[PDB]
Design a protein around this ligand. Structure first.
Ligand SMILES: *[C@@H]1O[C@H](CO)[C@@H](O)[C@H](O)[C@H]1NC(C)=O
Ligand SMILES: *[C@@H]1O[C@H](CO)[C@@H](O)[C@H](O)[C@H]1NC(C)=O
Ligand SMILES: *[C@@H]1O[C@H](CO)[C@@H](O)[C@H](O)[C@H]1NC(C)=O
Ligand SMILES: *[C@@H]1O[C@H](CO)[C@@H](O)[C@H](O)[C@H]1NC(C)=O
Ligand SMILES: *[C@@H]1O[C@H](CO)[C@@H](O)[C@H](O)[C@H]1NC(C)=O
Ligand SMILES: *[C@@H]1O[C@H](CO)[C@@H](O)[C@H](O)[C@H]1NC(C)=O
Lengths: 99, 226, 50, 50, 24
């Protein structure tokens, strides 16, 4: 095995598993490693383009390297967590708002 | 002989999809509105490119049959030959002069097997020799047409030969054009679907630099530091 | 502009933190991610002030 | 606080149409040669199993 | 159903983001 300075062309195998959508996961689409929900998507790609970016170059839709199916993406949900309350001097009850 | 190529040479620089955006880009390109060499056959000199070559060999009778890339092309360094032989596209990267001189019939490294103006663009960086193409009919067959056409990548090759010279290959028993490519900044505008429809140089002339300080093709009147 | 600032190295090896994670985990990871954090922190602060 | 739904699963997706190169051919072979007249085959540009 | 007034509708029709943000 000689590893010449040029990039190595013959490599080991790629152990690829199944893809599940409508519930966010970490994902590994050949470099694309974000964290979000994948879903079916409609917008059409050209025969060779490989990502989908948008207004500020955020990875925004990707096609599976195995099957020609465009998938849309959205980062996992998240938001503030706050508490409304009557004063401690009038009660102790508490209602919580997820933002 | 020299002529003036209109807005031609653009090509999808990378493999991403943008939509209705106007995207700044920075790479090698053919500077808009430049002075183009014109070799006419039916001749056949040898022309070197440095780091990129706009090779839009035209057509009259479909007679162009290959390319040889390299330095000395005689049993010295491995070099590229790619032939369309009425069947397919065939790539062979050996090193010899005219040992394969059979044309029709009617110690080598890497292999790969795959009116109507055909433009191509080739460039070699980082051990990758990349090709982009576009085939389009022309009606004004007098000269290179006025319009906007966007090329597209066909086949990347991991051969990584070092190349600075090349000549066209014809078949005997049209012509071809060359400029060169230099580093510039363009402003591309991708359409709704994703296929390019216009672009502007940022260094072309006074206005354009403004047009790409705003990153938009509709400047309003006024006054702009650019 | 703020979001665009995530696409810049600020003098580190890359513009993503995951790649530097992959390449080098011991101290040099600190002496690189230091710069990502410093730069991104400025960008946020200089958004807040204006 | 800030609420953060958590990742649940990793997923791997690599080109699984695959190319190969049959090392089995040179092992399941019928063409073996002499010791000093030993051949060197510079093989590459495939996918190889180990 | 939205009781915007008429000239207010003209005004409205005239005038014309999740990497860690939110717009309340
Ligand atoms: C508030 O706290 C004081 C503490 O001495 C208590 O006496 C009072 O009942 C509480 N409620 C109101 C309305 O002041
Ligand atoms: C450049 O283009 C002009 C066309 O105006 C042509 O006359 C000239 O020969 C070309 N080359 C040079 C070196 O000027
Ligand atoms: C590539 O070949 C050219 C001659 O065709 C030579 O001038 C140049 O130095 C070579 N580049 C390398 C990296 O060897
Ligand atoms: C083209 O070349 C390939 C390989 O050299 C050969 O298999 C094929 O028959 C050729 N086609 C013609 C039309 O000569
Ligand atoms: C054999 O190798 C030499 C240099 O290694 C090369 O010049 C020659 O073209 C090769 N012969 C064939 C038939 O490829
Ligand atoms: C988009 O694709 C459709 C094909 O359904 C094509 O007819 C249309 O011209 C393309 N461009 C636009 C702007 O719709």
């Amino acid at each position: 095995f000689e590893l010449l300075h040029a990039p190595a062309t013959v490599c080991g195998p790629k152990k690829s598993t199944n893809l599940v959508k409508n519930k966010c996961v970490n994902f590994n689409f050949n470099g694309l490693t974000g964290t979000g929900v994948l879903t079916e998507s409609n917008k059409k790609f050209l025969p060779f383009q490989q990502f989908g970016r948008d207004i500020d170059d955020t990875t925004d839709a990707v096609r599976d390297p195995q099957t020609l199916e465009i998938l849309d993406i959205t980062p996992c949900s998240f938001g503030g967590v706050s508490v409304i309350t009557p004063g401690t001097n009038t009660s102790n009850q508490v209602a919580v708002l997820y933002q | 002989a020299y002529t003036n190529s209109f807005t031609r040479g653009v090509y999808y620089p990378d493999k991403v999809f943008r939509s209705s955006v106007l995207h700044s880009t920075q790479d090698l390109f053919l500077p808009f509105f430049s002075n183009v060499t014109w070799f006419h056959a039916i001749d056949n000199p040898v022309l070197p490119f440095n780091d990129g070559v706009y090779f839009a060999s035209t057509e009259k009778s479909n007679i162009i049959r290959g390319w040889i890339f390299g330095t000395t092309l005689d049993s010295k360094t491995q070099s590229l030959l790619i032939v369309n032989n009425a069947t397919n596209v065939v790539i062979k990267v050996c090193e010899f002069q005219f040992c394969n001189d059979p044309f029709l019939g009617v110690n080598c490294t890497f292999e790969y097997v795959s009116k109507n103006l055909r433009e191509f663009v080739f460039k070699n960086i980082d051990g990758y020799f990349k090709i982009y193409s576009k085939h389009t009919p022309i009606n004004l067959v007098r000269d290179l047409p006025q319009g906007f056409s966007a090329l597209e990548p066909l086949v990347d090759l991991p051969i990584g030969i070092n190349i600075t010279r090349f000549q066209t290959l014809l078949a005997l028993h049209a012509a071809y054009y060359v400029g060169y490519l230099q580093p510039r900044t363009f402003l591309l505008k991708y359409n709704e679907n994703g296929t390019i429809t216009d672009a502007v140089d940022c260094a072309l002339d006074p206005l354009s630099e403004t047009k790409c300080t705003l990153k938009s093709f509709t400047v309003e009147k006024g006054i702009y530091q650019t | 502009t703020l979001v665009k600032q995530l696409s810049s190295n600020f003098g580190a090896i890359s513009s993503v933190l995951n790649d530097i994670l992959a390449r080098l985990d011991p101290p040099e990871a600190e002496v690189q991610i230091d710069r990502l954090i410093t730069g991104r922190l400025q960008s946020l602060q200089t958004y807040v002030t204006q | 606080s800030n609420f953060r739904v958590q990742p649940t699963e990793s997923i791997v997706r690599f080109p699984n149409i695959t190319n190969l190169c049959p090392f089995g051919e040179v092992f399941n072979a019928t063409r073996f040669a002499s010791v000093y007249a030993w051949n060197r085959k510079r093989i590459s540009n495939c996918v190889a199993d180990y | 159903p939205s009781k915007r007034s008429f000239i207010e509708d003209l005004l409205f029709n005239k005038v014309t983001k999740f990497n860690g943000l939110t717009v309340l």
